Amino acid sequence: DVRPVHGVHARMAEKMTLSHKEIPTAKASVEVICAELLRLRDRFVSAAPEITPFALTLRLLVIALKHNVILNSTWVDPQVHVHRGVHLGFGAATERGLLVPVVTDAQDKNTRELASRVAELITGAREGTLTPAELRGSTFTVSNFGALGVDDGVPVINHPEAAILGLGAIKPRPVVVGGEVVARPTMTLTCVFDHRVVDGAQVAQFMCELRDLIESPETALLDL
Amino acid sequence: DVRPVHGVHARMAEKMTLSHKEIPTAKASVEVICAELLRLRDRFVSAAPEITPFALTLRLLVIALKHNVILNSTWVDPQVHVHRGVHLGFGAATERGLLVPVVTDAQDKNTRELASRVAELITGAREGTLTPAELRGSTFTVSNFGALGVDDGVPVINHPEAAILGLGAIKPRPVVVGGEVVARPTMTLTCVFDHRVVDGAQVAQFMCELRDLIESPETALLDL
Amino acid sequence: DVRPVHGVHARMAEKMTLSHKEIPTAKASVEVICAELLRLRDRFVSAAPEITPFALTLRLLVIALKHNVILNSTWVDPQVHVHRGVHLGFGAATERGLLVPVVTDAQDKNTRELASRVAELITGAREGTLTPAELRGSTFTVSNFGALGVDDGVPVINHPEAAILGLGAIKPRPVVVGGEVVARPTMTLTCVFDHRVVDGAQVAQFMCELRDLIESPETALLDL
Amino acid sequence: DVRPVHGVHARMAEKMTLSHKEIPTAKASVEVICAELLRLRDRFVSAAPEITPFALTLRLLVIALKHNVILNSTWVDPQVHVHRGVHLGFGAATERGLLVPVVTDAQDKNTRELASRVAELITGAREGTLTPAELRGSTFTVSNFGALGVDDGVPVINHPEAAILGLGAIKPRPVVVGGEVVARPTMTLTCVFDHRVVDGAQVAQFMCELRDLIESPETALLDL
């Protein structure tokens, strides 16, 4: 059973090989309580159902990247090029394989706008109508394997980016709150990073800020 | 204290180096409740004590591979060669080091037969009587580091395979069942995969199917 | 009110007369707890609703016949001819009377395949489209009078078979479990057998194995 | 797979055929509470472990036959020959098939003597040392299919006897005692009788007397 590798599959393999040989990666994970994230999604169902837990996570990620600029950067053979634009790539599973559409200038989109653009890109990925511009130019990538049932994971960095964020499955899990064991919806976030560009203190600051935003979304108003 | 690398150790090192340079890997993990797995092992103690939790996990893995054929394959420099035979390699710790015996044609073995062949291979690995045929030709490999006390792990793919499955330690852990925090025997499964061959949707479908089989083994009867 | 006996009715009467004059029968019954049988049917409703409690009982009967080969046999005027093929006849009530369609080579069918063939045969019996090949050649027959409300029964052996299995109605009945009287769905199975071919120890081993498979379907995995 | 019928199997088949063609049978069953039967067996374990629940049931059957003489008789082509001697046949499952050893003059044996003779006959059946005299001449037969796990059954009369008694499995089952549902060890007794010799009132008197003796064994002292 021989299957020649072509189109979408071939693009995926070439990209994975390039990332593997070039980037010395490290990983950091944080457990995040998602009770307030889902309650906020519920508040938006009536007016803007496109605002899913994934779209809310991406909006809060954009805030964390604004305050942790080294995560949205590239190693250049040596210099680090820090990108002002946040062009967010995200994995979209299709019948032909993995596509990684890109939300260009995500830093300029509000929650509703970001969720609307994500929905358009998912539709385009499924219908095979994305242009080449919509599939390149990302500065940071997200892999929502949690939507597929994976509890935690380690994705491959989208070369030449400095980091990728994996989003584990949101489901009820036991956690300690106020000294008591309770059930909460949670997810594990995993950041895989180019350790030439980002150090552990930088990744930890970024992940802790993003965890705290997800756990209490109203705190995002501080600089909005 | 200089220790020249020879025989079993040398074979392990050459294999690890080859896998490392060639394969762009990603990882996905799922938490699995093992209460029904251990209860089924208890039912078989009298008639077939060779049917351990490891042998039951391997039998259910064979079903999952039948329905997720891309996991039992090889990248060929480009084509993907999907193997119809499931030749299951598994790690066996010995006094001389790691041996990886292979259950040839595991797809044709029933639970009792698979458990019997696994027991024979473990005996042969311990006594140093395995032939070269019994130590090559695997299409998928399993690393039961959980039997050694490791809660979760990331093994190295057995080149030129597309994936390896790590089995974390089975022990009581807290989980949420029906909104309540309860204790259950659980284990974390980790699949390390060649991302040129297998995408995240494929690995997630495979891991979720295998988790569901382990959690309710009677569901394996659907296509048996 | 005189009703001449023709077609389907005439075939039934000739077959009943032949069985009556030739076979010295005995009967054995076992009470079977059906809680796990119905829970497994519930698990399969979404993917394979054809897998009813009757289809699951037939699949488990095929396993029991594999391990109790003397039940699938014929007395030949003296020799016993033990059949390797399990061609399962089952009663299907139609508007024209009783038809006994046959699942040929049931030993080679998995649960889904067996349930699909049973559904096809029931449709054919109701629509009057079964061929003569689909109505002959059985080696063992089942009478599901329980689906018609009968609590327990004694069917007639389908000559020249050595045995028939009657399936009583599945409904909640009191039983003792762990010293306590509890309610469980149960059914009484009754095997009517040719005592020239099968003795009481053989029928008891067969019925106890089939009861144990129905009561804990996951134990069917032992040799699958 | 052709198996010529010889020796023990051939004897069984000839006997079953003769009984089938000649005897118009009817069946009557009674449910019997076995709590006192098992408590009495427990009292005798130390001094006489040969006195099993089966041996106690046979001793009480001998009392019931003394008071219901028509059950120990033969139809003679017309006359009924009522036998004064009670020569008790009982089924003994062996590796070669069913043997039916006979306790000659069981009416003259006390409990210990009857249990000792039953144990000798079971040993002889298993070792293949029974003489032809020990395998013929019964006037009443018992089939303890309950010891093999069968809940209730219908054995074949041992021609030319007028009746056979089947003993269902003794196990805990729900019953009503003093208006309350409780768990008790119980068994179903089934008498298959030649309706030319014995009528329903005669079989009912016999079965009710035997049930009452088993339920309260001390009542056997009335005429002992």
B216, B210 in Cβ contact below 8 A?
Answer: no
Q: In this structure, what DSSP letter does residue D86 have?
A: -
Tell whether the torsion through CA atoms of D30, D32, D37 and D38 is positive or negative.
positive
B156, B133 in Cβ contact below 8 A?
Answer: no
A50, A38, A32: which is closest to A151 by C-alpha? A32
Helices (H), B7-143: 7-22, 35-44, 53-66, 111-127
C196, C163, C148, C210: which is closest to C24 by C-alpha? C196
How many Cβ atoms sit within 10 Å of the Cβ of residue C14? 12
Distance CA D209, CA D207 (A): 5
Q: What residues contact A218, with CB distance under 8 A and at least 6 apart?
A: none
The token duo for D148 is 């093999």
Indicate the resolution in Å: 1.5
Distance CA D183, CA D88 (A): 32
CA diameter of chain A: 57
Distance CA C99, CA A133 (A): 66
Q: Collapsing DSSP states into helix, strand and coil, what is residue A157?
A: coil
Count chain A–chain B contacts defined by CB atoms under 8 A.
Answer: 103
Q: Phi first, then psi: give them for residue B199, nearest 5 degrees.
A: -95, 175
Using a threshold of 3 CB pairs under 8 A, tell whether chains A and D touch. Answer: no
What burial letters (b/e) apply to A90-126, b meaning 16+ CB within 10 Å? bbbbbeeebbbbbbbebbebebeebbbbbebbbebbe
One-letter-per-residue 3-state SS of chain C: CCCCCCHHHHHHHHHHHHHHHHCCEEEEEEEEECHHHHHHHHHHCCCCCCCCHHHHHHHHHHHHHHCCHHHCEEEECCEEEECCCCCEEECEEECCEEECCEECCHHHCCHHHHHHHHHHHHHHHHHCCCCHHHHCCCCEEEECHHHHCCCCCCCCCCCCCCEEEEECCCEEEEEEECCEEEEEEEEEEEEEEECCCCCHHHHHHHHHHHHHHHHCHHHHHHHC
Chain C residues close to B110, C-beta within 8 Å: 222-224
D135, D53, D129: which is closest to D88 by C-alpha? D135
Distance of CA D82 to the CA centre of its chain: 18
Pairing of strands C163-167, C180-194: antiparallel
Distance CA C140, CA D178 (A): 45
D143, C200 in Cβ contact below 8 A?
Answer: yes
Tell whether the torsion through CA atoms of D129, D131, D136 and D137 is positive or negative.
negative
Distance CA D129, CA B188 (A): 61
The token duo for B200 is 């995240």
D140, D163 in Cβ contact below 8 A?
Answer: yes
Q: Phi first, then psi: give them for residue B117, nearest 5 degrees.
A: -65, -40
Distance CA B58, CA B65 (A): 10
Distance CA A158, CA A90 (A): 10
What burial letters (b/e) apply to C192-206, b meaning 16+ CB within 10 Å? bbbbbbbbbbbbbbb
Question: Which residues on chain A place their C-beta less than 8 Å from a C-beta of chain B?
Answer: 1-5, 10, 12-13, 16-17, 19-20, 91, 93, 97-98, 143, 145, 148-156, 171-174, 181-183
The token duo for D223 is 């005429």
The token duo for D127 is 């070792």
- Marked catalytic residue, from C9, C83, C152, C195: C195
User: What does each C-alpha distance from D89 to D134, D148, D149, D163 come to in angstroms?
Assistant: 9, 18, 20, 11
> What value, to the nearest 5°, has the Cα angle with vertex C35 and ends C34 and C38?
80
C168, C137 in Cβ contact below 8 A?
Answer: no
- Residue A160 preceded by cis peptide, ω within 30: yes
Distance CA C193, CA C163 (A): 4
Chains with ≥3 CB–CB distances under 8 Å to C: B, D
What burial letters (b/e) apply to B98-118, b meaning 16+ CB within 10 Å? bbbbbbbebbebebbebbbbb
Block residue for tokens 């005897």: D23
The token duo for C128 is 């009057």
Tell whether the torsion through CA atoms of D157, D158, D162 and D163 is positive or negative.
negative
C200 with D153: Cβ contact below 8 A: yes
* A7 φ/ψ sector (left φ>0, alpha ψ -120 to 50, else beta): left
Which chain A residue's Cα is nearest to B190? A153
Q: What residues contact A125, with CB distance under 8 A and at least 6 apart?
A: A92, A94, A99, A101
DSSP D15-82: HHHHHHHH--EEEEEEEEE-HHHHHHHHHHTTT-TT--HHHHHHHHHHHHHHT-GGGSEEEE--EEEE
Q: Which contacts (CB < 8 Å, 24+ apart) does range C13-16 have?
A: C15/C158, C15/C159, C16/C156
Distance CA D51, CA D38 (A): 11
Using a threshold of 3 CB pairs under 8 A, tell whether chains A and B touch. Answer: yes
How many Cβ atoms sit within 10 Å of the Cβ of residue D95? 8
Block residue for tokens 């008694």: D165
A82, A72 in Cβ contact below 8 A?
Answer: yes
Residue B211 identity (one-letter amino acid): R
